[PDB]
Design a binder for this molecule. Structure first.
Ligand code: DTP
Ligand code: CL
Ligand code: CL
Length: 312
């Protein structure tokens, strides 16, 4: 009587129904859930996420060491939501945000709501309040670690900060879903106390890390970042992405067009030279990057070709 694949589907179907779509998936499943998303600023990362970017109405955790490119991503996400006419909020407990750098990544800072809370409790209560107004497309909490309990801030023993995150996250997920607001928790590393509850509440968790220092030989242009989607409840998890961030600049589009253009074969890399349908792009990723910077026409058709092959 037993037919495994049949019984499996019935079980999987029941699992998703009792706990929500994506509670169980095959890693090679070709997801066809066009949920609304906020492009990550990185084409490869959006692909890695399987849905085109960060899902709307969900909790996102972006962790990693400092100088990994975490906030750059958070910032491109804000910029993209704003471009789509969305409103953005920034709960700041770090006081590190460089709005001039943000404007460079396309963020409309003048319209950016910023809040510099007195305590972790207040910081999350302010975020909850903004969220359940339903007016926001996205909200970024700078530093899970900086969300220190009031009691600690006023000189008091216990494990309070984690319960703080658990309780706040419990109340907030409901609002996020109804409002459709995406919440990005930036988690500078060294679990950061509240990172514990975040691990379970998140629909997406990004392991961000610095892996290289861009050269072009003998000086530095910027650094390369690698992101792994360790958790993904909307599309198969564990996929990875890489991209370049040049000093003072954000995520290099041209850089991403070159990388993906190579793996997906539209761009041919014969040794140290890059070529695109006949014409040469240059010797060394940088010259090619510079090339795509000037010959905007090319870049767009490549982007076009890469986009068509996987989804504009
Ligand atoms: N103000 C800036 N000017 C020029 N480059 C910057 C600036 N801020 C960040 N960068 C670049 C350097 C890194 O490759 C990428 C990492 O910084 P960022 O995205 O803020 O990472 P991060 O969030 O993991 O570390 P941090 O906690 O220092 O912000 O951004
Ligand atoms: Cl993007
Ligand atoms: Cl205070």
């Amino acid at each position: 009587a037993p037919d495994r694949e049949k019984a499996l589907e019935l079980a999987m179907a029941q699992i998703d129904k009792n706990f929500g779509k994506g509670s169980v998936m095959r890693l090679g499943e070709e997801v066809r859930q066009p949920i609304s998303v906020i492009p990550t600023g990185s084409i490869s990362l959006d692909v890695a996420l399987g849905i085109g970017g960060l899902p709307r109405g969900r909790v996102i955790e972006i962790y990693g060491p400092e100088s990994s490119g975490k906030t750059t991503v958070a910032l491109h996400a804000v910029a993209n939501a704003q471009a789509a006419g969305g409103i953005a909020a920034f709960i700041d407990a770090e006081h590190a945000l460089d709005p001039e750098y943000a404007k460079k990544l396309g963020v409309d800072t003048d319209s950016l709501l910023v809040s510099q809370p007195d305590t972790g409790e207040q910081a999350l209560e302010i975020a909850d309040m903004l969220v359940r107004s339903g007016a926001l497309d996205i909200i970024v909490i700078d530093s899970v670690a900086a969300l220190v309990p009031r009691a600690e801030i006023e000189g008091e023993h216990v494990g309070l900060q984690a319960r703080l995150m658990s309780q706040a996250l419990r109340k907030m997920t409901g609002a996020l879903n109804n409002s459709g607001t995406t919440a990005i928790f930036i988690n500078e590393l060294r679990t950061t106390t509240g990172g514990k509850a975040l691990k379970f509440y998140a629909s997406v968790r990004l392991d961000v890390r610095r892996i290289e220092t861009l050269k072009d030989g003998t000086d530095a242009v910027g650094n390369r970042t690698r992101v792994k989607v360790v958790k993904n409840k909307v599309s198969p998890p564990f996929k990875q992405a890489e991209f370049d961030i040049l000093y003072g600049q954000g995520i290099s589009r041209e850089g991403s067009l070159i990388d993906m253009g190579v793996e997906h074969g539209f761009i041919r890399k014969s040794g140290s030279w890059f070529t695109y349908e006949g014409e040469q792009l240059g010797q060394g990723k940088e010259n090619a990057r510079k090339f795509l910077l000037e010959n905007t026409d090319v870049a767009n058709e490549i982007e076009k070709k890469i986009k068509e092959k996987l989804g504009i």
